[PDB]
Design a protein around this ligand. Structure first.
Ligand SMILES: C[S@@+](CC[C@H](N)C(=O)[O-])C[C@H]1O[C@@H](n2cnc3c(N)ncnc32)[C@H](O)[C@@H]1O
Ligand SMILES: [Zn+2]
Ligand SMILES: [Zn+2]
Ligand SMILES: [Zn+2]
Ligand SMILES: [Zn+2]
Lengths: 15, 272
């Protein structure tokens, strides 16, 4: 999507 | 370079004095790798987000707190700040002040409207950094940050600060271009993913965190507002036992040319 840092979303896998 | 009338010594000293002005645990700068004196002297360290035009802040009239008379860790049911969590309801932190292993990507902390003191157990992110960090020059990447103390898994490091900008401004700053970017999308919640954090001119020490395909720190969305999901704290927590002098890195994806992380599972692309 972008050349930008992302949080990865809140989909859980235990951050 | 507009700073060419300053000397390597004075530029490094000026950046060192800039580091000394930071409130909290000390931040040091070393460069035993190349002759670059310091990062940009125009950069400004901040302790909170630098809002810009077009960024709507949360409305204080929508804000609620908890009635915990701070909060008790052994009784998470009474606290209203954890209502968005499914059962079994619990705080994000254990008795050692570290994020729990079973905690998700969203942390619900207390805020200024709670009947809480500043040393409530649910204000770890708010209290801020406790680990002294060191900015250093790396081999193949730019600058980097390493911890000077042991950081067991779950230890809070710091937040990713900077200017908060809109999508139009983020594209306008998506680009000078040299493979260096400090843009961090606020995309934790897909129902409201509108703003981006730009650490170019304003930011935290986290602005020097590098990418690794096998990271030792990770991002948690520390939310102290009600239902406001466009702006939140990008809190870095250690997901691995970090020893002294070990470089702090996080996955830019969130789980210039090639990736130089050197992990055995390197995907080859930063994607950010
Ligand atoms: C947030 S800055 C980190 C470096 C430091 N803040 C600086 O300005 O020198 C991100 C940039 O560092 C580079 N970088 C970060 N991690 C890298 C990696 N693992 N391998 C190669 N380059 C990396 C990328 O080019 C990216 O644009
Ligand atoms: Zn509290
Ligand atoms: Zn409470
Ligand atoms: Zn509260
Ligand atoms: Zn890699």
């Amino acid at each position: 999507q972008t050349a930008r840092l992302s949080t990865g979303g809140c989909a859980p896998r235990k951050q | 370079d507009s700073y060419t009338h300053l000397s390597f010594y004075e530029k490094r000293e000026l950046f060192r004095k800039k580091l000394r002005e930071i409130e909290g645990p000390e931040v040091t700068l070393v460069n035993e790798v190349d002759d670059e004196p310091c990062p940009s002297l125009d950069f400004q360290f901040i302790s909170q987000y630098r809002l810009t035009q077009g960024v709507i802040p949360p409305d204080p009239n929508f804000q609620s707190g908890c009635n915990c008379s701070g909060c008790d860790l052994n009784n998470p049911s009474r606290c209203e700040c954890l209502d968005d969590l499914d059962e079994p309801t619990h705080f994000a932190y254990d008795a050692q002040g570290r994020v729990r292993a079973d905690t998700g990507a969203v942390i619900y902390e207390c805020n200024s409207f709670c009947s809480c003191s500043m040393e409530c157990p649910n204000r770890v992110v708010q209290r801020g950094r406790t680990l002294p960090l060191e900015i250093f020059k790396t081999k193949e990447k730019g600058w980097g940050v390493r911890s000077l103390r042991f950081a067991p898994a779950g230890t809070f490091i710091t937040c990713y600060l900077g200017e908060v900008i809109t999508s139009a401004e983020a594209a306008k700053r998506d680009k000078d271009d040299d493979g260096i970017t400090y843009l961090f999308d606020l995309d934790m919640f897909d129902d409201a993913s509108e703003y981006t954090v730009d650490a170019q001119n304003y930011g935290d020490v986290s602005r020097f965190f590098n990418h690794s395909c096998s990271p030792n720190i990770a991002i948690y969305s520390a939310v102290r507002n009600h239902g406001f999901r466009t702006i939140y704290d990008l809190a870095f927590f250690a997901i691995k036992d970090i020893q002294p002098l070990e470089e702090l890195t996080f996955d830019y994806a969130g789980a210039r040319r090639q990736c130089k992380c050197g992990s055995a599972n390197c995907r080859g692309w930063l994607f950010g």
